[PDB]
Structure 1
């Protein structure tokens, strides 16, 4: 195939239970590579799993060909579940998002600020 991975400025971070590096993808002729299709080749490179691997960034140059991004590879799964930002755990579902606007949260708080002892119906009856 044309696609190829090459790492750069590798660093083994023990203070956060991961190894981080920069990723080069030499993929001429084709569109950008999907993130899924990258992370499994990193696995085969480091012999762990396509589950403790996270990748992001990935801007493509002018002219086609290369792209460069950032990648991290955790030791356990749960260390990733602790040390990752939540939205990056959401990308490949491992977390979920809730309340449907900033307005509703704001305006509930302002209605509740005008009652004492039990804020009651403003939450319990919406």
Structure 2
């Protein structure tokens, strides 16, 4: 309600093909309308659709009535996918990282050391203990 997105520190970034900016959202008394709302709202300003817009940061300001965050708008989805930090993709789901996770890989790596050749053998050796 009664937001307005005011863009400090605007950057035309031609070499990562994106408009990079701070998002300053005034509110009447309660800090922060949704991240999804902000991407939609911003989307019709620069006319790029919200699906090439990512928004991150965000931290409510005491006594309400403001929230400063950060946004990026990619000219195309290809550009977004190519600068691409995993956490940014994660933030509103559409890709998340590995879920193997971690100690499975370490066990596997220790199995490979034992013998020379025979890939499949070491997989099966890692797989029998669950313990």
Q: Same fold (TM over 0.5)?
A: yes
Equivalent residue number for residue 97 of structure 1: 97
Q: What displacement does 1:98 show?
A: 3.2
Equivalent residue number for residue 129 of structure 2: none
Q: What displacement does 1:31 show?
A: 5.1
Equivalent residue number for residue 8 of structure 2: 8
Give the direction of change, closer, same or farther, for the CA distance of 1:43–1:99 in structure 2 (3 Å limit). Answer: closer
Q: What displacement does 1:92 show?
A: 3.3
Give the direction of change, closer, same or farther, for the CA distance of 1:68–1:97 in structure 2 (3 Å limit). Answer: same
Q: What displacement does 1:87 show?
A: 2.6
Question: Which ranges in structure 2 are unaligned for 5 or more consecutive residues?
Answer: 127-131
Rounded to whole Å, the distance in 2 between the matches of 1:94 and 1:10 is 27
Q: Report which stretch shifted further, 37-46 or 93-102.
A: 93-102
Q: What displacement does 1:100 show?
A: 2.8
Give the direction of change, closer, same or farther, for the CA distance of 1:97–1:4 in structure 2 (3 Å limit). Answer: same
Rounded to whole Å, the distance in 2 between the matches of 1:123 and 1:91 is 33
Q: What displacement does 1:99 show?
A: 3.6
Equivalent residue number for residue 58 of structure 1: 58
May I ask how many residue pairs the two structures share in their alignment?
126
Kept in 1: contact 2:111–2:123 (CA 8 A): no
Kept in 1: contact 2:52–2:73 (CA 8 A): yes
Rounded to whole Å, the distance in 2 between the matches of 1:114 and 1:78 is 43
Q: What displacement does 1:55 show?
A: 0.7
Rounded to whole Å, the distance in 2 between the matches of 1:54 and 1:42 is 10
Question: Which ranges in structure 1 are unaligned for 5 or more consecutive residues?
Answer: none
Q: What TM-score results when the alignment is normalised by the length of structure 1?
A: 0.88
Q: CA RMSD in A?
A: 1.8
Kept in 1: contact 2:25–2:66 (CA 8 A): yes
